Design a protein around this ligand. Sequence first.
Ligand SMILES: Nc1ncnc2c1ncn2[C@@H]1O[C@H](C[C@@H](N)CC[C@H](N)C(=O)O)[C@@H](O)[C@H]1O
Ligand SMILES: Nc1ncnc2c1ncn2[C@@H]1O[C@H](C[C@@H](N)CC[C@H](N)C(=O)O)[C@@H](O)[C@H]1O
Lengths: 234, 235
Amino acid sequence: NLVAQRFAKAGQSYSKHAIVQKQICQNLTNLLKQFCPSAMSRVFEIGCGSGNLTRLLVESFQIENLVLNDLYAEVQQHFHVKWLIGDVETLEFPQQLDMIVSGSALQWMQDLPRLLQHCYAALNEQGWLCFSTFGPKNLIEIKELTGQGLNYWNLENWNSALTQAGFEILHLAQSETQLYFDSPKAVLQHLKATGVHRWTKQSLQQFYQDYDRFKHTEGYSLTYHPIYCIARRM
Amino acid sequence: KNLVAQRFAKAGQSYSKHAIVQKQICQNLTNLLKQFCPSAMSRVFEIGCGSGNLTRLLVESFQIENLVLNDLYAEVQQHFNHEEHVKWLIGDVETLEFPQQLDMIVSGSALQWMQDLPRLLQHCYAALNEQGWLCFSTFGPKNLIEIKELTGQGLNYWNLENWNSALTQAGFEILHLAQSETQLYFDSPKAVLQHLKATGVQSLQQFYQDYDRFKHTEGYSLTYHPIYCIARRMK
Ligand SMILES: Nc1ncnc2c1ncn2[C@@H]1O[C@H](C[C@@H](N)CC[C@H](N)C(=O)O)[C@@H](O)[C@H]1O
Ligand SMILES: Nc1ncnc2c1ncn2[C@@H]1O[C@H](C[C@@H](N)CC[C@H](N)C(=O)O)[C@@H](O)[C@H]1O
């Protein structure tokens, strides 16, 4: 017996900053372990990259066939497992899937409704669509000070698009985490390290000075805004 | 410099097997243990082990040389068979001398019953090794608030800031301290009482009628308010 729920969570943490991406993959995997059976036959992963999610997925789930996708063949350097390299928005999906899973990749998509339609057509009845992406305040400090950043869907955008694509929402949540760095230069070092070129001295100095607007008692904020979703073909 | 403080807020919608609420809390705490704690911890003291919902997860994911299990009631021992590396410390944890030289003190869904948490945290500090771990789940003030309002029965719970201040006072650094307020939405008030009996927690018609004050769009609310903590003895 499943019951609907709504929740609010809040707290503080004191953790490594270089592992944010893997931590998001761990949080998505922890959700998979709830909603999904331990055994699955056919899984398709969109945008596997280095495999931060892939490692956790095979460790927690018994898969018989795993299809991995990413834009570039260079990711296979980091690696019953098939590969489909290319733009997922034009690739032929593997068909008759038990689950489509994707961590931190859908924010790069040009036409999300059309991609969701292809996800719906490729999944079995009651097939799983499970993903993490990011919401409108992801890296908001960087967008405010540099003018660069993606335009992100909010939670209601996703709720609407998933419903029109024919999916049942089992979990849909937004999390907002402020990391507090000791100095503005530590923020840029973090972004350079985690993979998110030299700037001019003037741009750098203006950036450091403008970052005073994000100073807290704990430090200078950098915001991550992941969205987590467990959905089902209805 | 590799560690940064952070603050977070999460919100969303979900579905849960309502019967698994206490097991889910144990799993959530165990996930935090796995994130923060080393895989091997020689000496571990569990407070309020009960039937072992947290104990089984702890032994599964951590290499423990001496596991000291406490509960108020000896009856909990019936839920364990041929448990390995265990020392039993049956009794009121608020009166018992703690085991010495601990690598971790851990507790799931038991601290809400404590009559004197500040003194307990002092005993935790004294029993732990240098930078030893104190890791627990408990509940906050909105836990089962609908049942407290309608029946008058319920505990007084510490809030998150109470814990923050008490841990720092007792000599612990806080690696993780968080709360989740979750409203479960049942189809009818009858289903709320069935859930409560299954999980182990004129008047009946008045209870059903009184539950109208908790009617939402999704159904009739029952709130759980778990609190999770990863802490370490300050060097
Ligand atoms: N249109 C696209 N088709 C396929 N892969 C894409 C597309 N756009 C971006 N990607 C990949 O999406 C990945 C996104 C990265 N944030 C890595 C995600 C990876 N799952 C992880 O969490 O480690 C990169 O490997 C991109 O190359
Ligand atoms: N003063 C006390 N000293 C020791 N154990 C206690 C005390 N008060 C309550 N308990 C135990 O705390 C436990 C709380 C229960 N919610 C079970 C928790 C258990 N860790 C579980 O996850 O199943 C019960 O077994 C109680 O008997």
